[PDB]
Amino acid sequence: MQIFVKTLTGKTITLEVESSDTIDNVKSKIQDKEGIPPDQQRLIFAGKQLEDGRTLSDYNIQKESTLHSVLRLRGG
């Protein structure tokens, strides 16, 4: 399938995805390609947070959709 994510440094990548693959697997193909730490990266669709454990099918996202990857942190 196909999804595009912009990164925090202003670089977006083109990825190949499939309704059956788990979101963790795709977050890792990208970690190898551009290096975004998966536990420190959050993929979102229309104000909802994506869980590495559900497949992209359950989140009705169709071909060519754009997701926002965001960072999480506290420190205290």
Side-chain angles (χ1 to χ4, degrees):
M1 264 299 178
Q2 285 93 30
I3 292 296
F4 311 172
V5 172
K6 320 300 188 309
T7 64
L8 254 70
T9 318
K11 186 282 191 342
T12 204
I13 313 156
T14 242
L15 212 62
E16 179 279 281
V17 301
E18 56 260 89
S19 156
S20 82
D21 210 49
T22 46
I23 298 172
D24 58 86
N25 179 108
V26 242
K27 65 169 179 52
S28 36
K29 195 156 22 62
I30 193 168
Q31 147 67 265
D32 295 275
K33 203 190 194 35
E34 181 72 279
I36 194 169
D39 187 272
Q40 169 64 27
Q41 93 89 324
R42 158 89 61 92
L43 296 191
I44 174 110
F45 165 82
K48 294 158 170 324
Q49 133 294 149
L50 296 277
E51 272 308 278
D52 305 309
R54 200 94 314 222
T55 58
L56 358 99
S57 231
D58 253 83
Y59 263 130
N60 56 223
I61 282 186
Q62 276 52 269
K63 183 186 291 180
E64 197 180 86
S65 194
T66 290
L67 284 140
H68 239 270
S69 189
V70 315
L71 272 63
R72 285 222 43 158
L73 64 304
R74 155 152 312 133

